[PDB]
Ligand binder design. Structure first.
Ligand code: QYK
Length: 331
């Protein structure tokens, strides 16, 4: 769909410019003459596949809207939706630039532990809200690009792109999440729950502070190998229940598991998050040496929280309420 700047829709919206594009269609900046404000309009492609998935996205956003609580305001507000020229159109509040752009603006050197903490608190609050029983919504595509600043002057954020999202027990796809942020349970082909978003968050928070993705796999086998470098071989009880365990691992006579090796990774569990964060060495690449709010003690709290978010076991992985009570968030 060609949308000229200046185009008027339904004596209500004046199209200004293209903000964004995706597999789903496009996002435009538009002026709403009724509310007298600028809005972001997500225009879904005129194809059955994209329409049907966007209808689920609208349903989940409307479900979230009807829950007025103090935890709901870290999610982008869907204002309304309509059909226009056979495109489902979703109208959101305007937000600012995304956390990938924030990292690109640091030349991928990362933001402070204090700004990382502010992001972590908001995102944990958002995940607590999605875990509301009557919602039980799995985002399924958390990544820096899907987290937007509310205002370029400020550190408030909201999550966008409920395009892949599903309620617990309403799974469609086995293959979900962006690979760098993909949970071990999804790599392993296991039935997934809200814990996959907490895995993504853990990955995201390390990257926000280092500037670089924690686990930058080139394909699923590389992804799982990069996870094993930092966290070791997944527990046997998980691998024993995983449809895809033998994509990555081999079981021995004594019920132990080991990596499948290919042609020539650091040995399992020897790429320590302790060294990635630079806990005892002035932070990532020693770039935070002597900076306020980047003490060893501050770093150890952060490391502890992240290792709880990166539990292989989705049963025992930290949940949003408990993440919010972690010492990392104490004054
Ligand atoms: C790129 N982008 C997306 Br996706 C939005 C949503 N939802 C959004 C938005 N609401 N404001 C600005 N840019 C945006």
């Amino acid at each position: 769909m060609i949308v000229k700047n200046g185009e008027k829709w339904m004596d209500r919206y004046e199209i200004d410019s293209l903000i964004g594009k995706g597999s789903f269609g496009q996002v435009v900046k538009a002026y709403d003459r009724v509310e007298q404000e600028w809005v972001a309009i997500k225009i879904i492609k005129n194809k059955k596949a994209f329409l049907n998935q966007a209808q689920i996205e609208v349903r989940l956003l409307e479900l979230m809207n009807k829950h007025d609580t103090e935890m709901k305001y870290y999610i982008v507000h869907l204002k309304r939706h309509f059909m226009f020229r056979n495109h489902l159109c979703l109208v959101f509040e305007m937000l600012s630039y995304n956390l990938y752009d924030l990292l690109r603006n640091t030349n991928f050197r990362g933001v402070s532990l204090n700004l990382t903490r502010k992001f972590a608190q908001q995102m944990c609050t958002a995940l607590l809200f999605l875990a509301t029983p009557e919602l039980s919504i799995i985002h399924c595509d958390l990544k820096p690009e899907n987290i937007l600043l509310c205002n370029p002057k400020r550190s408030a954020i909201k999550i966008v792109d409920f395009g892949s999202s599903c309620q617990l027990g309403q799974r469609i796809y086995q293959y979900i999440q962006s690979r760098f942020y993909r949970s071990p349970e999804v790599l392993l082909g296991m039935p997934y729950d809200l814990a996959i978003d907490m895995w993504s968050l853990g990955c995201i928070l390390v990257e926000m502070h280092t500037g670089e993705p924690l686990f930058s796999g080139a394909n699923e086998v590389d992804q799982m190998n990069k996870i094993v470098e930092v966290l070791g071989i997944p527990p046997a009880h998980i691998l024993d229940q995983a449809p895809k365990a033998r994509k990555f691992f081999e079981k021995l006579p004594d019920g132990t598991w080991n990596l499948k090796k290919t042609k020539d990774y650091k040995p399992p569990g020897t790429r320590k998050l302790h060294n990635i964060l630079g806990v005892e060495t002035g932070g990532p690449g020693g770039r935070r040496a002597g900076e306020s709010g980047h003490t060893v003690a501050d770093y150890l709290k952060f490391k502890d929280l992240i290792l709880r978010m990166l539990d292989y076991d989705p049963k025992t992985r930290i949940q949003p309420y408990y993440a919010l009570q972690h010492s990392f968030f104490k004054k």
